[PDB]
Design a protein around this nucleic acid. Structure first.
Ligand SMILES: *[PH](O)(O)OC[C@@]1(C#C)O[C@@H](n2cnc3c(N)nc(F)nc32)C[C@@H]1O[PH](O)(O)OC[C@@]1(C#C)O[C@@H](n2cnc3c(N)nc(F)nc32)C[C@@H]1O
Ligand code: MG
Lengths: 558, 400
DNA sequence: TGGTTGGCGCCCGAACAGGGACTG
DNA sequence: GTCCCTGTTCGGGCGCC
């Protein structure tokens, strides 16, 4: 039937009119399926015949459903969608089985013909006009308009999801202890009743939905585990993801890399240790999905170890609110992080990964903090609370980092775990000048026009060096000067710079950077035993910054 | 009942379209309980997706009470909303109490054409349900237009108390009422409870005397190294941008040549005198600093470590209206973010008492870090605007 | 088959904003 | 003013429902 729920008033954008696109040619099989759908929807009032009083049209088509027998009627409403009002989407995310609480009895059932059972705003119906060719030259093509939500329109998802919420509201109010996970037309229903009393509550729900014009066919009414839900299999005490098939190529294209990384991302929710850094790096700079990208040795190695992870049997468990959430993070190589969330040891609720590269320059402690923030936000969505963390970082290492770092940074309640590779700071800048260490006054200068530059240093022990640079910037010459001083000094060195740009990078203690120059500077800092870096204002005659400033400025400035 | 006042957005501006951020289970349960009671009384009504606007919502819990407070982050709508002598005596009172008078707005209807912009969305745990949306039917708490429309009614309620207590300064900002008096503590608290009984008929602590300024201080040593003088010269050089009287001729000439940082430099009498003169200049107030109500207040905060936080309030660079410090917990269980959120509240509370406006904060924190936890420590009914900065380690060294 | 819509995820690059330093 | 180098957001491809 059609739901007796009130329609949602919808308008076009100001100054706009309905679409006027003509139908494209269709296959004989496509036509035979559309007339069978349109004749029935007309008998049920879901679509109404129109005539010359309606001047709009939009091309329609059809594809196979997931059951692969019936057809799904679609409409290419791209032009109408540009001219339809904005909506606020009500679907805020995707439910996850790790957030399901243990229930005694579970039902999963779907509403049949969902969109076509919710009425459309009467004043908007004429804009959904379409024409279906029939038996031409024996009868012309019939023109219809939608009286219900069409598939392909911008507003149909949000209007249906909101309508479904209003329909379920009286039942939820009457049955607050029946959990109903509502995603599109699919309903997960869980109770703490015996299976007999549970089924009677299901029939009350079905009758409630039927009263609002939403059928629940028995073919989509699951009554025994495992339940097929949201791409998972729900067993009574565990859940698994439906089998994931990675591509099998010898000449990967950009499109194949996307499908590979995409399916790996989807697998990382329960498969621990998934890594996609080397595979995703192969896409930096590409343009076409057809480009065959040769896999690097570490990218092919990264793919090989992912395949071995997927061949293992894995499953998740359900959420028990009476126990704590525990998140454990494992450090992977090159800014990659995997984690497991659980409440009982070796019983993962779910897993995940983190490898987003933030900032040009960063260290392992910054990234671990970012992974903790991501896991915390993700935990609040799924469970509504923050987990207790188990991190491979010493308490002293964290104390050292948040002491010296100028930004506000914090990690919630966490306990150290000895799971190498451990997170640590690879060097530390001294807080005071070093007695007995040579003092370097570094400086750089570049010419904005010619891009020529100079970097160098003077030392209190009489040493000076100047290096010429090409295609450089002022900021780079300042880093080249620091790098030069590190190369030509002993294991302990005092460096005075006038560049707060270079000072800000180095005081943050990065161990990795997108810049090769900064990476070469990091490698020097790790080899040193003591480094003290100080700052003076430039162009103020402060010796010996004045001496080095004259050396690097000569020939490129003034 | 009451005739509605037509309110519109600023010209060329649409309504807010800000996504709801993830809420904890305790906050959603609190918001659901509150919204069902607000809907039962006609204060809010359910809306659908055909309303294209949205404003984020959360809830805070007062210290020792199981009562929650619904907070709507309305500062995007407030900026887009179309636009009295601030009491200069409020900042010179012994004790000032802040009272939440937000419930007063719920008795005045809101313009029907404007209700669409007050939309907000209650999320669900694990996305069990689509977001459930509402809009406001009465004057909403946290909206800039709510105290404006209720102004005439607020004067009627406060008229008898202000006449009976002329030595008491009552000031309103957003949902907050600031009550300051020079009465002794205890007698002051009796007047606060008296005013609470007065506000109940209709229905339905700060010590600004001790707010001090933190001036720029200079180190004092018997032995100066090349490094000590270099740090002092760079600090005075930056300080001369605020205090043009600062000179650094005699100090910087001690650094001529290419010396080791740990070399001892005896201060000459000229350099010694130049330093003492600079200390007196840093005690003088910054000259030519005049508050502009039409320009934004800017608050910069520096993490000084060990629970120490410094801040400056200005409108033009180097034109500081106030420079203070905020020292707190000095332990190993220190929460940087918690101390920062508390710092921005105290700084905002001071800006409201002094100038009657909320400042725009330059926060020394990653954006994701702040958005993850800042609501966990919020206790005010207003929310200031903020941006996130990559602070230089220089301004930290200047303000100690 | 191909040709639709919405949600979320990831990773990428384009297109911005904000602050510091530069030129004669 | 411009150049440089940060930062964030948005929209593209793919993944999942
Ligand atoms: P999983 O366990 O496979 O669940 C399938 C399902 C649900 C619930 O997830 C939704 N879905 C899957 N793939 C989708 C695409 N490409 N688009 C949209 F909008 N939804 C998708 C729907 C699906 O349930 P199903 O019973 O298939 O259809 C229900 C319905 C509703 C309400 O979703 C709409 N719909 C379904 N497929 C659609 C396509 N390809 N395009 C549009 F515009 N809409 C689609 C209509 C249905 O009435
Ligand atoms: Mg320089």
């Amino acid at each position: 039937p059609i739901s007796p729920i009130e329609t949602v008033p919808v308008k076009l954008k100001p100054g706009m009119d309905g679409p006027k696109v003509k139908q494209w040619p269709l296959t004989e099989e496509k036509i035979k399926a559309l007339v069978e759908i349109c004749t029935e929807m007309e008998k049920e009032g879901k679509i109404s015949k129109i005539g010359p009083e309606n001047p709009y049209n939009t091309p329609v088509f059809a594809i196979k459903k997931k059951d692969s027998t019936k057809w799904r009627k679609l409409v290419d409403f791209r032009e109408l969608n540009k001219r339809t009002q904005d909506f606020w989407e009500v679907q805020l995310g995707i439910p996850h089985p790790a957030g399901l609480k243990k229930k005694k009895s579970v039902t999963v059932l779907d509403v049949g013909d969902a969109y076509f059972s919710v009425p459309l705003d009467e004043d908007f119906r004429k804009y959904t006009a379409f024409t279906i060719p029939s038996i031409n030259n024996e009868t012309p093509g019939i023109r219809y308009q939608y009286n219900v939500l069409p598939q392909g329109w911008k507003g149909s998802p949000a209007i249906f999801q909101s309508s479904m919420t209003k329909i379920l509201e009286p039942f939820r109010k009457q049955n607050p202890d029946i959990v109903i996970y509502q995603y599109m037309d699919d309903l997960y229903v869980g109770s703490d009743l015996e299976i007999g009393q549970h089924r009677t509550k299901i029939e009350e729900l079905r009758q409630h939905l039927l009263r609002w014009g939403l059928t629940t066919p028995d073919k989509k009414h699951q009554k025994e585990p495992p339940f097929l839900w949201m791409g998972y299999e729900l067993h009574p005490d565990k859940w698994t993801v439906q089998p994931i098939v990675l591509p099998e190529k010898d000449s990967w294209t950009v499109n194949d890399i996307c499908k590979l990384v995409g399916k790996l991302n989807w697998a990382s929710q329960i498969y621990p240790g998934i890594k996609v850094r080397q595979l995703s790096k192969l896409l930096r700079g590409t343009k076409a999905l057809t480009e065959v990208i040769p896999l690097t040795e570490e990218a092919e190695l990264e793919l090989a170890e992912n395949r071995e992870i997927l061949k293992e049997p894995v499953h998740g468990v359900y959420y028990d609110p009476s126990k704590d959430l525990i998140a454990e993070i494992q450090k992977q190589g090159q800014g990659q992080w995997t984690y497991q969330i659980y409440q009982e040891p070796f019983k993962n609720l779910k897993t995940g990964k983190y490898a987003r590269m933030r900032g040009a320059h960063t260290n392992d402690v910054k990234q671990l903090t970012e992974a903790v923030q991501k896991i915390t936000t993700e935990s609040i969505v799924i469970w509504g609370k923050t987990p207790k963390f188990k991190l491979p970082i010493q308490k002293e290492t964290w104390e050292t980092w948040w002491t010296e770092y100028w930004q506000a940074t914090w990690i919630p309640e966490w306990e150290f775990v000895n799971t190498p590779p451990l997170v640590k700071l690879w060097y530390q800048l001294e807080k005071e000048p070093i007695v007995g260490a040579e003092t370097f006054y570094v400086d750089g200068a570049a010419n904005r026009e010619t891009k020529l530059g100079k970097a160098g240093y003077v030392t209190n022990r009489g040493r000076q060096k100047v290096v010429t640079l090409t295609d450089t910037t002022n900021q780079k010459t300042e880093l080249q000067a620091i790098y030069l001083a590190l190369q030509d000094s002993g294991l302990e060195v005092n460096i005075v710079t006038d560049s707060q740009y270079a000072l800000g990078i180095i005081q943050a203690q990065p161990d990795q950077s997108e810049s090769e120059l900064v990476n070469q500077i990091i490698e020097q800092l790790i080899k040193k035993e003591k480094v003290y870096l100080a700052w003076v204002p430039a162009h103020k005659g402060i010796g010996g910054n004045e001496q080095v400033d004259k050396l690097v400025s000569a020939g490129i400035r003034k | 009942p009451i005739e509605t006042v037509p309110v519109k957005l600023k010209p060329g501006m649409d309504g807010p379209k800000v996504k709801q951020w993830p809420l904890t289970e305790e906050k959603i349960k609190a918001l659901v309980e509150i919204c069902t009671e607000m809907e039962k009384e006609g204060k809010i009504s359910k809306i659908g997706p055909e309303n294209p606007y949205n404003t984020p919502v959360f809830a805070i819990k007062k210290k020792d009470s199981t009562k929650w407070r619904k907070l709507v982050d309305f500062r995007e709508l407030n900026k887009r909303t179309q636009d009295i002598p601030h009491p200069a005596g409020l900042k010179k009172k012994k004790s000032v109490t802040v009272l939440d008078v937000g419930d007063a707005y719920f008795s005045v209807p809101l313009d029907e054409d404007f209700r669409k912009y007050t939309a907000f969305t209650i999320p669900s745990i694990n996305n069990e349900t689509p977001g459930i949306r509402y809009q406001y039917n009465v004057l909403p708490q946290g909206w800039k237009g709510s105290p404006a429309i209720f102004q005439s009614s607020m004067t009627k309620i406060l008229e008898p108390f202000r006449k009976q207590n002329p030595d008491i300064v009552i000031y309103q900002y957003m949902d907050d009422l600031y009550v300051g008096s020079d009465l002794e503590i205890g007698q002051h608290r009796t007047k606060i409870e008296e005013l609470r009984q007065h506000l109940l008929r209709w229905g339905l602590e700060l010590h600004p005397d001790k707010w001090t300024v933190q001036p720029i201080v200079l180190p004092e040593k018997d032995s100066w190294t090349v490094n000590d003088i270099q740090k002092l010269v760079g600090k005075l050089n930056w300080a001369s941008q605020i205090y043009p009287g600062i000179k650094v001729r005699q100090l910087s000439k001690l650094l001529r040549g290419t010396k080791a940082l740990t070399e001892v430099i005896p201060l000459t009498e000229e350099a010694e005198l130049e330093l003492a003169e600079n200390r007196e200049i840093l005690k003088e107030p910054v000259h030519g600093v005049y508050y502009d109500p039409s320009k934004d207040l800017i608050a910069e905060i520096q993490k000084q470590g060990q629970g120490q936080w410094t801040y400056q309030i200005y409108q033009e660079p180097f034109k500081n209206l106030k420079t203070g410090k905020y020292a707190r917990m000095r332990g190993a269980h220190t929460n940087d973010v918690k101390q920062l959120t508390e710092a921005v509240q105290k700084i905002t509370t001071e800006s409201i008492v002094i100038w009657g406006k909320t400042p725009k904060f330059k926060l020394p924190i990653q954006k994701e870090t702040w958005e993850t936890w800042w609501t966990e420590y919020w206790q005010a009914t207003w929310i200031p605007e903020w941006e996130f900065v990559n602070t230089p380690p220089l301004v930290k060294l200047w303000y100690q």
